[PDB]
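Quick one before lunch.
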Amino acid sequence: SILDTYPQICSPNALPGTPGNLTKEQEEALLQFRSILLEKNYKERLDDSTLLRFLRARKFDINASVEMFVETERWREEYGANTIIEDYENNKEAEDKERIKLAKMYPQYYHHVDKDGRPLYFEELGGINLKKMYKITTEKQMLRNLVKEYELFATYRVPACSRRAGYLIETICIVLDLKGISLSNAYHVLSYIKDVADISQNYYPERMGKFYIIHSPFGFSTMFKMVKPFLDPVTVSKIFILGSSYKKELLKQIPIENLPVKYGGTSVLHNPNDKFYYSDIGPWRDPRYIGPEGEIPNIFGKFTVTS
Ligand SMILES: CCCCCCCC/C=C\CCCCCCCC(=O)O[C@H](COC(=O)CCCCCCCCCCCCCCCCC)COP(=O)(O)O[C@@H]1[C@H](O)[C@H](O)[C@@H](O)[C@H](O)[C@H]1O
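Model of the B7N complex:
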């Protein structure tokens, strides 16, 4: 499969329980877990990386990991995640036309990688006017956009970033810019955040690498206690709400040349009149690292900025 064509072992510098870094008991658990799933007629998504994500998510409790995996496989079928990329491509023009309507008001863009090679993903929320947004999208449409991205991440971004790094890259580095948000608006969208958290926690285990929140209102750290019940403590431990010294904090994790100027770095788009909210720059655009999966589709259509 495509998995044979990029590295499937993590760096030796990675966390415990990751591919290539297992203890003997963890290796034995992985073999037992795979054996159980094969005996239950599963054939897909049984690679080391996937299965160890599920095992780590349940602290190597095999039966709990089986339940989580069984529930994920059925969810993928019920929701349409297994065909979401193909379905998008079969209606690409109409879907891109609608997606671009959201982009300026709600920037969502990958831009290069962190120091360890993870895809680096930015969102900016301070330009959202909720009344205006809900004229051009629905909550469940935004949720499906996010699932489609999770599938693009796994299908295109992981392979390219892994080939670049020479080791398996399984996780994302997120920077969420909250400059200008209202905490009452945040409260009003808590049900959407819960929907995002439920799908992400239950069906996309161990995909989060690091999650920085910048420019948040003074009261955001305590408002965030309303989100924590939707998240596991492991996930919370990867979320860092940064203060006024955030630029240098990001630079511990991200090469300066990969970070936009406005967030402390030196990265500028090749045409400086282009907009980050139409951009999708990173190793998945480098022909050296694009493999037999082919190149990622361009989610902003003819407006997509790839340099
Ligand atoms: C409607 C518009 C508003 C959108 C405003 C909300 C927009 C949503 C904000 C950010 C979306 C981007 C998040 C993308 C997540 C990608 C990675 C991912 O899927 O990670 C997965 C988890 O992803 C999530 O939980 C997603 C939710 C993250 C918290 C979202 C924070 C949002 C708080 C700031 C928003 C408030 C400002 C709003 C302002 C609104 C202004 C109008 C897997 O986690 P991980 O730790 O790797 O493994 C888990 C495993 O899974 C569990 O089983 C185990 O029990 C546990 O031990 C671990 O093994």
